[PDB]
Each structure stands twice: as structure tokens, then as C-alpha cells.
């Protein structure tokens, strides 16, 4: 019992919402059961009262000692002060449902006996179940598993409610009176649940309804079964289309560029290299383009995400001490991440150079024209002698080939000058370090 409950990094609070879910699920799944079936007998009534008192104690402990302790954000600032948390929960819209649910109609047991229709206000605390659903769907690493289990749970719950309504209608017409009603001969909940399954699921094969109340019942129940089965198909389609969305988008762009390379008659080796790039990009990043993702975020989280992945790689090179931090942040926001297949040429000796290469998760070699001089492992630098020079400047000194699936981080010279025009003093000191180092 902390002074203030964080409710995002609190597994204990998730276990408490599991406890209010279990009390609320006891009420929803055992209100109509005791209300319709004769499972509230005289030698089980203390067991039903013991678990219903445990349910009311969990409801009351929720309304008193946990839900007035929740850390919430008002006006930007988070709140720790416990009287202010108590004022926020007391002036919330959860408290209307909670104090409307915990109203003791169990003191009305002296008027009309032990009747669980008095306790049918305990099902009004649905917001604890939906808070538990949202909190479990947010903590889970695979939300489609819990969406499938929740759609199964709603399906089994509507079949349980329909089994209780069929046993009410059987007791209302009389048990064993007509051919449609329940006969009486087996386990009452199992045969009534079987009828609710074969009606709700729109199967049929049951006895045909005989009187007019049974025809109205079977007609409304078959209509609700059509819409329950249609909602079940729609929920499974939503889970499927939101489960294979990234895979279907990757496959759609892959077959789109295969259709382009077959439409313009491109050979099998180049098509195999494009397909090898696509399979390695899916096996590494599990996404098509990371720049398309990072263009959606704010600039501050973009800055921190670029810093935590590249600032160690920039600072582990001995060259980059003297550069200033605003230019370093802008060049880390203006890095481009490309991939090189094994054997590809990143720097051909004699071509023009316009790129500073920051290597990350790869291993390229320099060939000065097949001997290995120094195998550049991850974190190293090359392409630094054509970035500092104006115009053509210097050509490449050696053929640089990528040995493995190298994932270079590239810094183009045009984007470097587009950074540099907003930083004159940085341009000056950068040119000075350029002249001293070369």
C-alpha cells in the first residue's frame, strides 16, 4: 500500500486490477446463474455468501484504499500529494459508478429473501474491467493474443447469458411442458448451454418451437446469433488485418518492385540482389524504411533516438572532439541509413566522392586491387577525405568493398553544406580542423 500508485510501472496495481476483474467477473458470471438455475441451495448458501462478501470487500477496498491513490497528470504536472489525488478521484466519473455499484441492497434480503436480483447493481463496475483490459493490452508484448482471448471470453459470456435466459423461459413455460423447453433430465447448465450454443451459433438441429412465446424467443435468439457470429468474424478479421499489416505492406512493396523489374526486363542476378536486400531488411529491421517511421515523431524524441544510437559511434572516433554539439546534433538528424549487399562497391578508386561513411553493424574492407589492407570493423570511418574538399577535390584512394551485409550510415556533402549554411562559426572552425588534419 504505497502513498501514491504510479499505475503505469506498477505490476502490483495490475494485480489489483486483476482482483477487481475477478470480483466483477464473479458478479457478471454468477448473478444470472444463481438468479435462474437452482444452484443457490440451502447447504451452499453460506458458500455463495462467503464469496459474495469477498467480492464486496474487494469492491470496497478498491473504492477506499486504492483508487484514491492514483498518480494522475493535471495541467502537465504529475501529482504526488495524496489529498489532491483523493480530491481528483472523488470528483471523477469512476466514483459515480463505484458508489452506485456498492449500494448494499443485501440489506434488502429480509424483504424478498435471498435474491441475486438485488445484487444486480454489482455489475455496474465495468470500468474496472475496461481499465484492466486496456492495462493488460498495453503491458502485453502481443496484443492479438489477448484480443483473441477477450473475443472468446465475450462469446462464452453471451452463450452463458443465453443459457440462463433459456432456462428462465423453460421454467416459465414449465419444465417438460412443450417440446422446445428444457426437459429436466441431465445436467441443467450443460444442456441449456448446449441449446444456447446451437441457437446463438445459428446451427439448429434442436426441437422446433411449439407455442408463440417459443417462436418469438427462437426468432429473436437466431437474429442475435446472426449478429453475434458476424461480430465474431469482424473481430477475427480485425485481429488478422492488424496482425499481418506490416508483413502485408512489406510483401505488397516487394511484389510491386518485382512487377516493375519484370515490366522493364531486368535480369535474374539484379532481381536476385534486390530480393536478397528485401529479405535481409525484413530479417534485420522488420520494417521497410526507418526514415518513414522517424519522420512522424517529434523533433525532441527524434533527437534523443538519434543520439542514443549514433553519438557513441561519433564520439568513439578520435576526429570528432572539436566539433560543436549543435552541428553534431543536426548531422545526426541528417544521417541516412543504407544497406550494402556482400561484395558491393561503396568507394570505387577514381570515382567522385561526396559521402562520409559511418559504419554500423557491418564489416567492409579496403582493397589497395584485391589485397586486404585494414579490415574496417563496425564503428570506424572512411570517406572523410572527399567531404572536406570543395568541388571535385580528391578521388578515392582505394577500392572499398563490403565483405558482409554492411549497414552504412551515410552523410552526403550536399546535406553537410545545407547544415553548414546555418552555422558560420562552426563552418570556420571545421575548416580550420580540416586544414590542420590535412
Amino acid at each position: 500500500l504505497p502513498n501514491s500508485i504510479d499505475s503505469y510501472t506498477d505490476r502490483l496495481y495490475l494485480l489489483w486490477l486483476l482482483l477487481v476483474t475477478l470480483a466483477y467477473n464473479w458478479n457478471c458470471c454468477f448473478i444470472p446463474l444463481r438468479l435462474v438455475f437452482p444452484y443457490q441451495t440451502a447447504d451452499n448458501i453460506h458458500y455463495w455468501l462467503i464469496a459474495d462478501i469477498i467480492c464486496d470487500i474487494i469492491y470496497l477496498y478498491d473504492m477506499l484504499f486504492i483508487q484514491p491513490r492514483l498518480q494522475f497528470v493535471r495541467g502537465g504536472d504529475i501529482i504526488v500529494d495524496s489529498n489532491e489525488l483523493r480530491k481528483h478521484y472523488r470528483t471523477s466519473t469512476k466514483f459515480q459508478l463505484d458508489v452506485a455499484s456498492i449500494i448494499p441492497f443485501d440489506i434488502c434480503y429480509l424483504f424478498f429473501g435471498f435474491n441475486p436480483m438485488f445484487r444486480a447493481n454489482r455489475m455496474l463496475k465495468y470500468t474496472s474491467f475496461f481499465e484492466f483490459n486496456h492495462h493488460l493490452e498495453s503491458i502485453m508484448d502481443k496484443a492479438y493474443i489477448y484480443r483473441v482471448i477477450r473475443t472468446t471470453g465475450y462469446l462464452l459470456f453471451i452463450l452463458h447469458i443465453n443459457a440462463c435466459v433459456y432456462y428462465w423461459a423453460s421454467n416459465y413455460e414449465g419444465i417438460g411442458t412443450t417440446r422446445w423447453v428444457y426437459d429436466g433430465e441431465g445436467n441443467e447448465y450443460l444442456r441449456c448451454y448446449y441449446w444456447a450454443v446451437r441457437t446463438l451459433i445459428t446451427i439448429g438441429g434442436l426441437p422446433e418451437p411449439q407455442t408463440l412465446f417459443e417462436i418469438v424467443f427462437q426468432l429473436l435468439n437466431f437474429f442475435s446469433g446472426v449478429f453475434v457470429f458476424s461480430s465474431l468474424i469482424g473481430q477475427m478479421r480485425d485481429v488478422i488485418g492488424a496482425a499481418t499489416a506490416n508483413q502485408n505492406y512489406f510483401r505488397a512493396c516487394m511484389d510491386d518492385t518485382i512487377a516493375y523489374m519484370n515490366n522493364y526486363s531486368i535480369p535474374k542476378l539484379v532481381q536476385k540482389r534486390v530480393r536478397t536486400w528485401y529479405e535481409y531488411t525484413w530479417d534485420s529491421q522488420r520494417m521497410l524504411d526507418e526514415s518513414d517511421l522517424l519522420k512522424t515523431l517529434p523533433t525532441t524524441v527524434q533527437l534523443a533516438l538519434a543520439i542514443d544510437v549514433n553519438f557513441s559511434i561519433i564520439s568513439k572516433v578520435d576526429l570528432f572532439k572539436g566539433c560543436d554539439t549543435q552541428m553534431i546534433y543536426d548531422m545526426l538528424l541528417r544521417l541516412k541509413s543504407v544497406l550494402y549487399l556482400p561484395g558491393d562497391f561503396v568507394c570505387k578508386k577514381g570515382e567522385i566522392g561526396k559521402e562520409m561513411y559511418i559504419i554500423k553493424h557491418g564489416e567492409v574492407q579496403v582493397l589497395g586491387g584485391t589485397k586486404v589492407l585494414v579490415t574496417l570493423k563496425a564503428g570506424s570511418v572512411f570517406g572523410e577525405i572527399s567531404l572536406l574538399a570543395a568541388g571535385g577535390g580528391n578521388r578515392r584512394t582505394a577500392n572499398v568493398v563490403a565483405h558482409g551485409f554492411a549497414n552504412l550510415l551515410t552523410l552526403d556533402k550536399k546535406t553537410l553544406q545545407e547544415i553548414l549554411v546555418h552555422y558560420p562559426d562552426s563552418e570556420r572552425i571545421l575548416m580550420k580542423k580540416a586544414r590542420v588534419l590535412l
Partner: protein, 452 residues
């Protein structure tokens, strides 16, 4: 000389008052035609209700002869041109066919055949127009989509029940095992039993459940196979509409979750530290829980520039008149300033601008609480609050001073601040056409620089 307005609320109250007797005419005209105890038993009630439906049909002709229309932007308000634009429509032909006086033949046959009133179903366009106006007007569009779909398939299930009872009356009551049973038996001869068993048969056939007795004759085989193929099309539209309602009831939730899983996939690929990972994740859950996850430029993209400007004024101007600097300025500069603002939300602990950097942005605080700190850590010098302002001294680049364009202090956020980013270049191109306002902003910058 009254002209109604088709975008108003009087026209929508008339669309409700004419989608009542159109729906009555569809439902109870097929039922009174096929069942023949409804027409003969409740004859005074149907005389009263058909008088009401015909009076509302005449008034719908008089209202459609006064619905204004748009040419050159303005509402047309002259009665001769309204009557001419009504008369050159097909809807006038459908309305004057829907008011053909077949009550002469209805009194000729002995007030027993409402088969002659089936041209009263010809105002289906008023019913479709009411459902269209409600589905754009209401606050629960998915609940109205399911109410509209349930009304459409209940029209079809009711019409097919009346068709099955008319087919059974044509073949003979209780000659086969498929037709409706013998109505001289007093259990099946009641009208509630007739209609509810015919509706039960029609629901079972048109939703492809089939617990019905199997047909005997070829006309019954043919009607049952036509009803089963119509029923598999009706079940296909039910599953398609409820699947579309489920896919559009959490479309924004699914796109936010796709963004969350893509960020989590990127951060497990590049392997960021867990404090930054939970910072970005709690930052995105805060943006979803405070309903601000979608960017203001993408929400307001569909709007015209005039309504974008009025929305930007009515949001940002009550913040931008709490700044103690911009109080002597004009309407065009305030309009362009609240146009060129872009809000970015910061998390706690996040740095806005660090000391010793080149200033390229100006910030105006709105629903936030900040703190200028030193280089050591969390030392609150000034707590910048709601409506206050910073960043206005290192974007103007006033040379000849001791500071220049260097942001003089480390600024961090205390809470979940929601600043208004106002860029340097977005200010200098918001002062390019206004040189007197430019030198007024330079003289107030000289005042606040003489303070700094």
C-alpha cells in the same frame, strides 16, 4: 412566401416527419396486402393511418416545392424558380405518382384490397435522405449504421415473410408440408401466430439457418432456392457491414498501436537504453490518453485557410495575449504569428535548449510548467509557467552585445509541457512584408536585451 432551407433543422424535422409514413407505408402495406386479417380487422385504424400518410405526402409535395437550392452561392428564394426546379426533376414525377388517387378503386373493391396503394412506397428517396442526413448529423455514427442495417434487413425479412404467406395462400393452406398450416385449426388460425410463424420461417430461410420443413412441389423448391441465395447475400452484407463497423470503430486505435509497435521494433533493432525506451513509450501513452497524438497540421489539412486562421486565432490568441511583450502589435502580425506556430509536447526531464547553443527557435508555453536550470542538474532559478515566454533573445541576432545569439540558460521541463515552437526563419519571413513591425520587434528586443 416562406422558403425552407435544406441545410437547416426545420428541414431535418420535416425529414423525420416524412420518414415516419414512408416507413409505415412500406411495412404495413406489404403486411396488409398479404395477410388479409390485418386489413379486415383493423379497418378504422388503417383508414386513420392512411389519411395521415396521404396528408403528409401532400405536405411533402408542398415542402419540396419550397426547398431552396444553391446557384451562385446564395439560396434561391423566389417561388416560381423553386417550382420550376422542382418540376424539371424526376422526384416530382415520383411524388405525383405517389399521390395517385387509387382510393376510388380501393372503394370499388370494397375496402379490402390495399394492393392498389403500392404506389405509396414511391417516396423511398425521403427515407434514404433521412438516413443519410442522420448518419452525417448524429453523434453515434456506428450505432446509427447498425440501426440502419437492422432496419434494412428487417424490411427484407418482413417482406419475405409476407411473400411466403402469400405463396402459401396461393398454393393452399395445409395441402403440403412446406406451406403454412391449416388455418381452420384454431392454433394456427390466429393472426399473431400467422405473422410470427411467417416471420420465423423467413428469418430461418433468409439467414441460411434452415430449420423449416422441406418443400414438396417444384414452385416451393424454386422459391426456397431463390430465398436461400438471397439469404446468403443478406448474410454476406451483414458480415460485411458489422466487420466494417468493427474495423472503423477502432481505426485510430489501430493506427496508434501500429505506430507504437513500429517504434518498439525500431528501438529493439537499434537497441536503445531502457530508460529512453520507457521515456518514449510513456510519452506516447501520454499523447494518446490526452487525445493529442495526431499532429495539428494533419488534422487541419482539409480545412480552408480562412477556417484554419479562425481556429488558430480562437485557440492560440488567449495564450498569445498573455505574453507581456506582444501587447503593442497589430492584427495582421498576430494572425501570421498564430498561423506559423507548431505545438510540440515535451516529457519531464527533457531539455528545451541548452546553454551555449545557437538560437533558432522561440517558445511560448501553454499548459505546461518549465524551469531554467544551471549546468549542474536540477536547480530551479525561475519556474517558467503557463503563458510565459522564452527564446526571444537568441533568434534576433543582435550583435554588439555580450551574449550574441547564445541561449544564456539550460531550460528543462518539470511536467508534461506543451510549448509552441515559433522558428527563427518562420519569424523573419513573418516580418519581411512588415518593416515597421520589424523595427518595433527590434526595439522591444533591444529593451529585453538591455534587461538581459
Amino acid at each position: 412566401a416562406i422558403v425552407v432551407d435544406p441545410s437547416s433543422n426545420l428541414y431535418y424535422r420535416w425529414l423525420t416527419a416524412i420518414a415516419l409514413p414512408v416507413f409505415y407505408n412500406w411495412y404495413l402495406l406489404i403486411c396488409r396486402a398479404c395477410f388479409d386479417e390485418l386489413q379486415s380487422e383493423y379497418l378504422m385504424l388503417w383508414l386513420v393511418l392512411d389519411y395521415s400518410a396521404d396528408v403528409l405526402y401532400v405536405l411533402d409535395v408542398l415542402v419540396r416545392a419550397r426547398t431552396g437550392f444553391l446557384e451562385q452561392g446564395l439560396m434561391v428564394s423566389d417561388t416560381n424558380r423553386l417550382w420550376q426546379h422542382y418540376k424539371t426533376t424526376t422526384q416530382f414525377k415520383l411524388d405525383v405518382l405517389s399521390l395517385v388517387p387509387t382510393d376510388l378503386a380501393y372503394l370499388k373493391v370494397g375496402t379490402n384490397y390495399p394492393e392498389v396503394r403500392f404506389n405509396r412506397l414511391l417516396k423511398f428517396s425521403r427515407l434514404f435522405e433521412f438516413f443519410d442526413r442522420t448518419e452525417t448529423r448524429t453523434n453515434y455514427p456506428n450505432m446509427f449504421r447498425i440501426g440502419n442495417l437492422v432496419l434494412y434487413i428487417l424490411i427484407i425479412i418482413h417482406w419475405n415473410a409476407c411473400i411466403y404467406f402469400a405463396i402459401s395462400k396461393f398454393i393452399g393452406f395445409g395441402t403440403d408440408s412446406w406451406v403454412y398450416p391449416n388455418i381452420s385449426i384454431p392454433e394456427h388460425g390466429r393472426l399473431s401466430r400467422k405473422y410470427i410463424y411467417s416471420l420465423y420461417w423467413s428469418t430461418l430461410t433468409l439467414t441460411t439457418i434452415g430449420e423449416t420443413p422441406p418443400p414438396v412441389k417444384d414452385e416451393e423448391y424454386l422459391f426456397v432456392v431463390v430465398d436461400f441465395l438471397v439469404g446468403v447475400l443478406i448474410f454476406a452484407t451483414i458480415v460485411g457491414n458489422v466487420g466494417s463497423m468493427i474495423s472503423n470503430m477502432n481505426a485510430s486505435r489501430a493506427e496508434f498501436q501500429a505506430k507504437i509497435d513500429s517504434i518498439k521494433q525500431y528501438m529493439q533493432f537499434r537497441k536503445v537504453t531502457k530508460d529512453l525506451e520507457t521515456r518514449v513509450i510513456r510519452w506516447f501513452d501520454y499523447l494518446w490518453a490526452n487525445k493529442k497524438t495526431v499532429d495539428e497540421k494533419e488534422v487541419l489539412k482539409s480545412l480552408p485557410d480562412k477556417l484554419k486562421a479562425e481556429i488558430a486565432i480562437n485557440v492560440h490568441l488567449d495564450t498569445l495575449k498573455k505574453v507581456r511583450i506582444f501587447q503593442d502589435c497589430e492584427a495582421g502580425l498576430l494572425v501570421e504569428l498564430v498561423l506559423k506556430l507548431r505545438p510540440t509536447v515535451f516529457s519531464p526531464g527533457d531539455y528545451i535548449c541548452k546553454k551555449g547553443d545557437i538560437g533558432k527557435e522561440m517558445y511560448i508555453i501553454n499548459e505546461g510548467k518549465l524551469a531554467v536550470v544551471a549546468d549542474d542538474g536540477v536547480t530551479q532559478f525561475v519556474v517558467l509557467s503557463d503563458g510565459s515566454y522564452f527564446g526571444e533573445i537568441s533568434i534576433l541576432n543582435i550583435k554588439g552585445s555580450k551574449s550574441g545569439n547564445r541561449r544564456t540558460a539550460n531550460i528543462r521541463s518539470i511536467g508534461y509541457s506543451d510549448l509552441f515552437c515559433l522558428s527563427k526563419d518562420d519569424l523573419m519571413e513573418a516580418l519581411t512584408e512588415y518593416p515597421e513591425a520589424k523595427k518595433a520587434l527590434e526595439e522591444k528586443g533591444r529593451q529585453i536585451l538591455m534587461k538581459d
